[PDB]
Scaffold this active site. Structure first.
Site, PDB file in Angstrom:
ATOM      1  N   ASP A   1     -12.507   8.575  -8.438  1.00  0.00           N
ATOM      2  CA  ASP A   1     -13.779   9.079  -7.905  1.00  0.00           C
ATOM      3  C   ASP A   1     -13.650  10.383  -7.055  1.00  0.00           C
ATOM      4  O   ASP A   1     -14.616  10.768  -6.399  1.00  0.00           O
ATOM      5  CB  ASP A   1     -14.500   7.954  -7.129  1.00  0.00           C
ATOM      6  CG  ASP A   1     -13.766   7.521  -5.786  1.00  0.00           C
ATOM      7  OD1 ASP A   1     -12.862   8.232  -5.319  1.00  0.00           O
ATOM      8  OD2 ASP A   1     -14.098   6.473  -5.212  1.00  0.00           O
TER       9      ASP A   1
ATOM     10  N   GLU B   1       0.811  -1.242   0.000  1.00  0.00           N
ATOM     11  CA  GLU B   1       0.000   0.000   0.000  1.00  0.00           C
ATOM     12  C   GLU B   1       0.812   1.244   0.000  1.00  0.00           C
ATOM     13  O   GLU B   1       0.540   2.159  -0.726  1.00  0.00           O
ATOM     14  CB  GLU B   1      -1.023   0.014   1.162  1.00  0.00           C
ATOM     15  CG  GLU B   1      -2.062  -1.105   1.089  1.00  0.00           C
ATOM     16  CD  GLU B   1      -3.111  -0.906  -0.001  1.00  0.00           C
ATOM     17  OE1 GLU B   1      -3.074   0.164  -0.690  1.00  0.00           O
ATOM     18  OE2 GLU B   1      -3.938  -1.840  -0.214  1.00  0.00           O
TER      19      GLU B   1
ATOM     20  N   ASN C   1      -9.244   5.180   2.740  1.00  0.00           N
ATOM     21  CA  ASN C   1      -9.852   6.000   1.766  1.00  0.00           C
ATOM     22  C   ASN C   1     -10.863   6.936   2.394  1.00  0.00           C
ATOM     23  O   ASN C   1     -11.576   6.550   3.346  1.00  0.00           O
ATOM     24  CB  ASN C   1     -10.503   5.115   0.705  1.00  0.00           C
ATOM     25  CG  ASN C   1     -11.055   5.931  -0.479  1.00  0.00           C
ATOM     26  OD1 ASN C   1     -10.316   6.336  -1.405  1.00  0.00           O
ATOM     27  ND2 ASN C   1     -12.306   6.195  -0.444  1.00  0.00           N
TER      28      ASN C   1
ATOM     29  N   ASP D   1     -15.467  -4.873   8.935  1.00  0.00           N
ATOM     30  CA  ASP D   1     -16.597  -4.415   8.100  1.00  0.00           C
ATOM     31  C   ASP D   1     -17.372  -5.545   7.434  1.00  0.00           C
ATOM     32  O   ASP D   1     -18.519  -5.323   7.027  1.00  0.00           O
ATOM     33  CB  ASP D   1     -16.082  -3.423   7.012  1.00  0.00           C
ATOM     34  CG  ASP D   1     -17.195  -2.618   6.343  1.00  0.00           C
ATOM     35  OD1 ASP D   1     -18.025  -2.000   7.064  1.00  0.00           O
ATOM     36  OD2 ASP D   1     -17.223  -2.577   5.082  1.00  0.00           O
TER      37      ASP D   1
ATOM     38  N   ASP E   1      -6.607   8.175  -0.698  1.00  0.00           N
ATOM     39  CA  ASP E   1      -6.143   7.148   0.250  1.00  0.00           C
ATOM     40  C   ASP E   1      -4.932   7.746   1.022  1.00  0.00           C
ATOM     41  O   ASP E   1      -4.044   8.428   0.476  1.00  0.00           O
ATOM     42  CB  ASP E   1      -5.651   5.908  -0.488  1.00  0.00           C
ATOM     43  CG  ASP E   1      -6.772   5.251  -1.325  1.00  0.00           C
ATOM     44  OD1 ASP E   1      -7.916   5.327  -0.881  1.00  0.00           O
ATOM     45  OD2 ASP E   1      -6.489   4.691  -2.358  1.00  0.00           O
TER      46      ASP E   1
HETATM   47 CL   LIG Z   1     -14.711  -8.580   8.388  1.00  0.00          CL
HETATM   48 CL   LIG Z   2      -9.764   2.063   2.563  1.00  0.00          CL
END
Ligand SMILES: [Cl-]
Ligand SMILES: [Cl-]
Ligand SMILES: [Br-]
Ligand SMILES: [Cl-]
Ligand SMILES: [Cl-]
Ligand SMILES: [Cl-]
Ligand SMILES: [Cl-]
Ligand SMILES: [Cl-]
Ligand SMILES: [Cl-]
Ligand SMILES: [Cl-]
Ligand SMILES: [Cl-]
Ligand SMILES: [Cl-]
Ligand SMILES: [Cl-]
Ligand code: NA
Ligand code: NA
Length: 129
Positions: free
Chosen positions: A48, A35, A59, A101, A52
């Site tokens: 978009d 990264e 982001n 998430d 980041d």
């Molecule tokens: Cl997860």
């Molecule tokens: Cl991200």
């Protein structure tokens, strides 16, 4: 700050990333290598308009406020700039939210493409951890 490999591994471990949501330290070190090449000041603009930030290239569309990503969230409740600090605490805490998430580390495209399924333990070899 540009971290050393083992230096970052120690920092991430100290901040509770090792086996966080089941991902061993190597995975987090590998993700950071690709990264940001271990540079906390790394930034990259997306098509978009979002950007980041930091070692794990978090982001601005969902996760931090940079004042310039219209109709975005700030789920980590931080300014994106916090993600550029020599102190990785804000990046680590926000990454914990992100990996929680539902897609795990697949949130990090470079992790899926460069780290997933590989011998990620290699990334902590030789480190006093
Ligand atoms: Cl997860
Ligand atoms: Cl991200
Ligand atoms: Br352990
Ligand atoms: Cl390296
Ligand atoms: Cl590992
Ligand atoms: Cl942006
Ligand atoms: Cl701007
Ligand atoms: Cl900008
Ligand atoms: Cl914004
Ligand atoms: Cl907005
Ligand atoms: Cl730190
Ligand atoms: Cl998972
Ligand atoms: Cl030890
Ligand atoms: Na935002
Ligand atoms: Na914003």
């Amino acid at each position: 700050k540009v971290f050393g490999r083992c230096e970052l591994a120690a920092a991430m471990k100290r901040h509770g990333l090792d086996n966080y949501r089941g991902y061993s330290l190597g995975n987090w070190v590998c993700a950071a290598k690709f990264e940001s090449n271990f540079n906390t000041q790394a930034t990259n603009r997306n098509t978009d308009g979002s950007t980041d930030y930091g070692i794990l290239q978090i982001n601005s569309r969902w996760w931090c406020n940079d004042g310039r990503t219209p109709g975005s969230r700030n789920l980590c409740n931080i300014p994106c700039s916090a993600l550029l600090s020599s102190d990785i605490t804000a990046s680590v805490n926000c990454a914990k939210k992100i990996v929680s998430d539902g897609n795990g580390m697949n949130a990090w495209v470079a992790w899926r493409n460069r780290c997933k399924g590989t011998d990620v333990q290699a990334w902590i070899r030789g480190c006093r951890l």
